[PDB]
């Protein structure tokens, strides 16, 4: 069943991805697309505090930039849709130690969905429930199974256009978002073709076997936090070095200097 569980930073120059699958070397390429603007305000969410819970449902707008410097595999996937109930179709992405599962299905999501992890009395094996994420799943259309893609910052870009759902990802070692450039590589393109208006992050909680699991006293987890930003239609100038890797970019609307750079 469902269990009742319940700041801003600078984005600098993060959120650049490869616009197409064409190899280019040592060239300046201008492209109009949906990008996260430079030096924008990115919202920082503390999903779990110290235990205090706050995992809200956020709008999708024209695309989403997601970031997390987490190493405790608390964050496991995402939910996308419009009403997030049985009246419409929704998309669900779940990761674990061996695979990633993507499903377009008509789910009936709980108010506070999470993935429960159960450990055996002898510590040799465990299990994952997914019974607290949704109550029903019918009229199920799309399925996809692959290898998982989840001091270590992870960045994702989500777009939904032309009947395709596009995901780009990047993993980088760091030591609140850093400076510098790291272009996001294309991860997946799914021919899904649905409405997406809202989305919510999926977390994983462990079991405390001293109290029943239908209350907040039966689940425990560590602190988790993430960063969220939104994409807007902009013209960008990307630089491809000799190895075919994007190493710098210019936003043609940030300030008059950048506009002058793009004009030339």
């Amino acid at each position, epitope marked *: 069943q469902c269990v009742n569980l319940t700041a801003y930073t600078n984005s600098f120059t993060r959120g650049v991805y490869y616009p197409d699958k064409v190899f280019r070397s040592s060239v300046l390429h201008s492209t109009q697309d949906l990008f996260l603007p430079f030096f924008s305000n990115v919202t920082w969410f503390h999903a779990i505090h110290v235990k205090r819970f706050d995992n809200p449902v956020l709008p999708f707008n024209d695309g989403v930039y997601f970031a997390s410097t987490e190493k405790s595999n608390i964050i496991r996937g995402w939910i996308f849709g419009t009403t997030l109930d049985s009246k419409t179709q929704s998309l669900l992405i779940v990761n674990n130690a061996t695979n990633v599962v993507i499903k377009v299905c008509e789910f009936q999501f709980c108010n506070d969905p999470f993935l*429960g992890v*159960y*450990y*055996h*009395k*002898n510590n040799k094996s465990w*299990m994952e*429930s997914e*019974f607290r994420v949704y*109550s*029903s799943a019918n009229n199920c259309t799309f399925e996809y199974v692959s290898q998982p893609f989840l001091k270590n910052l992870r960045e994702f870009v989500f777009k939904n256009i032309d009947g395709y759902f596009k995901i780009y990802s990047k993993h980088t070692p760091i030591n609140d978002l850093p400076q510098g450039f790291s272009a996001l590589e294309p991860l997946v393109d799914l021919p899904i073709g649905i409405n997406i208006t809202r989305f919510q992050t999926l977390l994983a909680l462990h*079991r405390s*076997y001293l109290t*029943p*699991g239908d209350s907040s006293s039966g689940w425990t987890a560590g602190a988790a936090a993430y960063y969220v930003g939104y994409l807007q239609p902009r013209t960008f100038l990307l630089k491809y070095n000799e190895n075919g890797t994007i190493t710098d970019a210019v936003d043609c609307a940030l300030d008059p200097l950048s506009e002058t750079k793009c004009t030339l």
Partner: antibody
Amino acid sequence: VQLVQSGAEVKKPGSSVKVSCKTSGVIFSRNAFSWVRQAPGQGLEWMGRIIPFLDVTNSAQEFQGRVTLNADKSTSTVYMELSSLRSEDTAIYYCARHNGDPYDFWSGYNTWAGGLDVWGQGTTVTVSS
Amino acid sequence: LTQPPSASGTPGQRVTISCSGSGSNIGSNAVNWYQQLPGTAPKLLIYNQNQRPSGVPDRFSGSKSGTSASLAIGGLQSEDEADYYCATWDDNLSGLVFGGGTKLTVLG
């Protein structure tokens, strides 16, 4: 939530009896079930547990090698089979749903096994000659 | 589990039923109580040692001390004559165990 059983059965000693309990779609696929027998004028007795979506079956000490519990995903039915009938095996058999966590049962924590909120109408088995 | 075979009392009073067990079943696992009218299937009254399912009034209260448990009914009503079962899980036997039947004969 409803649990529908089969009809009352009359059997001869030494034969075998099969009792069915039919459930809905979600309830069958998200629950663990127990089988409880009650003799006429006596107290309740436990016969076994079955989790159809994990393929794990527990058994009673007095019903090992004599009671077979199985399931079948189509039409969502859970079956119990009794063999080597005795003259005093006439009773009423109930299929009941656990309100606890089947994953808690799988992990080995049975501190909340014993709650049965939903029950079937009951199948009367008369074993006589 | 062990419990007395019969009980009685006058309407409007507070009656109690005991259930004594060992340390491997009652002292380690939560206790549950059931009500069974003579013409129907048993019904759950108390679970998780204190809770009541929706539709059950507030007159039924469960308690536990050490390796024994008790069920108390306040404001006894003329339609409360039935069998009450004390049920738990035994780790040694590894199975459900019921404490037997207790009958309340309400005179008046």
